[PDB]
Amino acid sequence: QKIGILGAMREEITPILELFGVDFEEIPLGGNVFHKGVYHNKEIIVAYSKIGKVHSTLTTTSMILAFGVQKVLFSGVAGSLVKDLKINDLLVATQLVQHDVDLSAFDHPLGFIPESAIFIETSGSLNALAKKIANEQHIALKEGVIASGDQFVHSKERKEFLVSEFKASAVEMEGASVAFVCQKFGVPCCVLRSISDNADEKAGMSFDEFLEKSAHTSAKFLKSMVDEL
Amino acid sequence: QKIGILGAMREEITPILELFGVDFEEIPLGGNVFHKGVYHNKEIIVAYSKIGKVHSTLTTTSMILAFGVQKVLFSGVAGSLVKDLKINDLLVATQLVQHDVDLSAFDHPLGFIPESAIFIETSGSLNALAKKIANEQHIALKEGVIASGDQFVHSKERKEFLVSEFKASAVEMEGASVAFVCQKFGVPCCVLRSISDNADEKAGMSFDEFLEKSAHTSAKFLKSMVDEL
Numbered sequence: 001q002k003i004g005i006l007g008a009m010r011e012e013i014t015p016i017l018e019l020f021g022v023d024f025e026e027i028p029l030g031g032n033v034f035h036k037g038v039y040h041n042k043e044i045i046v047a048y049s050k051i052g053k054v055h056s057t058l059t060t061t062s063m064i065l066a067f068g069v070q071k072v073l074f075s076g077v078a079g080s081l082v083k084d085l086k087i088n089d090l091l092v093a094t095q096l097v098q099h100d101v102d103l104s105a106f107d108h109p110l111g112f113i114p115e116s117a118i119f120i121e122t123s124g125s126l127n128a129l130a131k132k133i134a135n136e137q138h139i140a141l142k143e144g145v146i147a148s149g150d151q152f153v154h155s156k157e158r159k160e161f162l163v164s165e166f167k168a169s170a171v172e173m174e175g176a177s178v179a180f181v182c183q184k185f186g187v188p189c190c191v192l193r194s195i196s197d198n199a200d201e202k203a204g205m206s207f208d209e210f211l212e213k214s215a216h217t218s219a220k221f222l223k224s225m226v227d228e229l
Numbered sequence: 230q231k232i233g234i235l236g237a238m239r240e241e242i243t244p245i246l247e248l249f250g251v252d253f254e255e256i257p258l259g260g261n262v263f264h265k266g267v268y269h270n271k272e273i274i275v276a277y278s279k280i281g282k283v284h285s286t287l288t289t290t291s292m293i294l295a296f297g298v299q300k301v302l303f304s305g306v307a308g309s310l311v312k313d314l315k316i317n318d319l320l321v322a323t324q325l326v327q328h329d330v331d332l333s334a335f336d337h338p339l340g341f342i343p344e345s346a347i348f349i350e351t352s353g354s355l356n357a358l359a360k361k362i363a364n365e366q367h368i369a370l371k372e373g374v375i376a377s378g379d380q381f382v383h384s385k386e387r388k389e390f391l392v393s394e395f396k397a398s399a400v401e402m403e404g405a406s407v408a409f410v411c412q413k414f415g416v417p418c419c420v421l422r423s424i425s426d427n428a429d430e431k432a433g434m435s436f437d438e439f440l441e442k443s444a445h446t447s448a449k450f451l452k453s454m455v456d457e458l
């Protein structure tokens with residue numbers, strides 16, 4: 001059984017490598033450094049894609065075609081779009097959308113691309129397992145729609161826009177592309193995020209502050225799940 | 230010698246398959262249908278990625294890791310940002326940038342992503358060869374910076390913005406990601422585009438009109454180049 005674990009930033013995967021505490025082989029490919037090791041009976045490939053949609057797509061595809069993972073778990077941080085989501089909160093993506101896609105000129109709804117779809121779904125069984133665990137350690141796991149684009153979101157306007165147009169709970173920059181690629185290759189994917197800011201004028205400050213911690217929380221949970229696979 | 234030929238839309242590759250007039254095997258992978266055939270002494274893999282940055286990244290990576298192409302030539306249409314570029318004109322990308330990337334909140338210049346770069350360069354030798362040929366058939370080949378994002382551009386404002394911020398000549402939605410991936414894998418890439426609109430309020434109309442033709446022109450040239458490899 002092969003499992004792929006992804007993060008966007010180095011900070012986000014460092015805790016992961018530690019929690020697994022196993023020796024990791026380093027395999028460079030496509031500008032990414034993949035950490036390959038063995039944990040229990042499962043083979044785990046870890047890596048940080050780097051920021052954005054292009055980076056994340058590239059890395060997920062490589063992960064699938066070169067290492068042939070069978071599952072993909074993503075952990076990272078995200079900004080909040082709603083009240084009931086607060087710093088350090090954990091969220092599991094139900095559907096993801098690319099909020100910055102705009103073929104409006106062709107009278108298409110926002111987020112739509114011909115031969116594609118607005119919303120991408122994630123693994124039913126993985127998400128189920130996430131809720132099980134979250135309920136086994138009294139962790140308040142919130143689930144919902146995550147919006148992804150290549151813009152760091154930090155303004156009240158854009159905030160309201162994502163909520164009204166897509167009814168999204170969280171915003172980030174790699175979820176959707178990751179989920180998209182996995183769907184194309186039929187790989188079950190789970191996208192987990194930990195709030196690190198509220199995507200407002202002060203999101204930048206708040207983000208620099210909670211990155212480390214929020215990254216960790218997310219990592220702990222993800223390790224919990226791998227243990228159960 | 231393996232060569233990869235990419236287009237964004239089916240319309241754009243259909244002419245290509247014809248001009249080569251050889252039988253093509255159809256190999257589906259990742260939601261894309263790859264056309265594999267033999268032309269002269271070279272092996273050519275053709276395909277349309279579908280629209281956008283995520284689609285184009287996904288497809289280029291697959292093309293490289295599963296088929297191991299050694300070169301990548303892209304042909305498609307683009308909107309114009311400057312006067313000296315008109316409908317049906319042919320352009321060869323010198324540098325490409327993702328104009329919709331914004332980490333400004335972190336006091337970064339637009340288009341910049343940590344561990345990356347704003348501008349991506351394309352193949353020096355391929356572009357050279359493009360100019361040779363263009364000069365062998367009295368074709369006015371214009372060269373320049375191409376801007377790519379996940380928004381169909383059609384407004385005077387955005388127009389001025391791409392020019393002033395990046396000094397771009399053309400705008401589209403797949404060039405940069407394609408060039409990026411190739412650079413990461415060290416594959417020489419050439420991005421050729423044929424104007425199909427002026428990226429203004431009427432870009433949508435003009436586009437529906439010239440798509441077919443502009444797609445063809447671009448295809449003819451690209452076939453000319455493959456003949457010389």
Ligand SMILES: Nc1ncnc2c([C@@H]3O[C@H](CO)[C@@H](O)[C@H]3O)n[nH]c12
Pocket residue numbers: 008009051052076077078079080151152153154171172173174196197198199203207
């Ligand atoms: N409010 C926000 N808007 C867009 N992305 C993010 C993020 C995530 O943090 C990184 C931006 O520095 C990037 O990987 C993105 O997914 N946190 N908060 C965000």
Ligand SMILES: Nc1ncnc2c([C@@H]3O[C@H](CO)[C@@H](O)[C@H]3O)n[nH]c12
Pocket residue numbers: 237238280281305306307308309380381382383400401402403425426427428432436
């Ligand atoms: N003015 C414009 N702005 C953004 N993309 C395009 C295009 C290209 O045509 C397609 C949009 O329908 C897409 O593949 C894009 O690269 N033509 N004109 C464009």
